[PDB]
Curated annotation (Swiss-Prot):
This is CD44 antigen. Disulfide bonds join 9-111, 34-100, 58-78. Cell-surface receptor that plays a role in cell-cell interactions, cell adhesion and migration, helping them to sense and respond to changes in the tissue microenvironment. Participates thereby in a wide variety of cellular functions including the activation, recirculation and homing of T-lymphocytes, hematopoiesis, inflammation and response to bacterial infection. Glycans are attached at residues 6, 38, 81, 92, 102. N-glycosylated. O-glycosylated; contains chondroitin sulfate glycans which can be more or less sulfated. The gene is Cd44. It comes from the Eukaryota. It comes from Mus musculus (Mouse). It is found in: Cell membrane; Cell projection, Microvillus; Secreted. Residues 13-102 form the Link domain. Expressed in the intestinal epithelium. Coiled coil: none annotated.
């Protein structure tokens, strides 16, 4: 009964989270997951500012109202070689990664590790934050509020 949350550097407060390293987060679960990080789904404007500070990924994830990939460098296998905030237009499927926005983060690039899930609630799941440098933090808890997500 274990969940890995792979997290990125923050850029202007925006970061990416993958659950178990596979596309597996619903839109409802995304909101709950950000809430557990004392964060919200980013707006498009927040994401554009994060991009301007150096944020890019090669993964689709939820923001407020869209599923996107921030891209700085063109890469053929990431967002069909686009740059900017690439918006997913057509997909059959509902489960992605998520982006999250924490207003209390530093204003530019913050590539320090994430050390807590401050707003997780009591629960039976071993939740492990996994940083890109391998640093891990674990706690027992839960963050999912919708039954359909568990
Ligand atoms: C999911 N694969 C295909 C590539 C996406 C990059 N992942 C790779 C796995 C990983 C592990 C810890 C932290 C982070 N940010 C990441 C990011």
């Amino acid at each position: 009964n274990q969940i890995d949350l792979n997290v990125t550097c923050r850029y202007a407060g925006v970061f990416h989270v993958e659950k178990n390293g596979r596309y597996s987060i619903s839109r409802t679960e995304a909101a709950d997951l950000c809430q557990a990080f004392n964060s919200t789904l980013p707006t498009m404007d927040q994401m554009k500012l994060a991009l301007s500070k150096g944020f890019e990924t090669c993964r689709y994830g939820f923001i407020e109202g869209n599923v996107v990939i921030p891209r700085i460098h063109p890469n053929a296998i990431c967002a069909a070689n686009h740059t900017g905030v690439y918006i997913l237009v057509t997909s059959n499927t509902s489960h992605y990664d998520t982006y999250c926005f924490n207003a209390s983060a530093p204003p530019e690039e913050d590539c320090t590790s994430v050390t807590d899930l401050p707003n997780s609630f009591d629960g039976p799941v071993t939740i492990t934050i996994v940083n890109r440098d391998g640093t891990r933090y674990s706690k027992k808890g839960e963050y999912r509020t919708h039954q359909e997500d568990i």
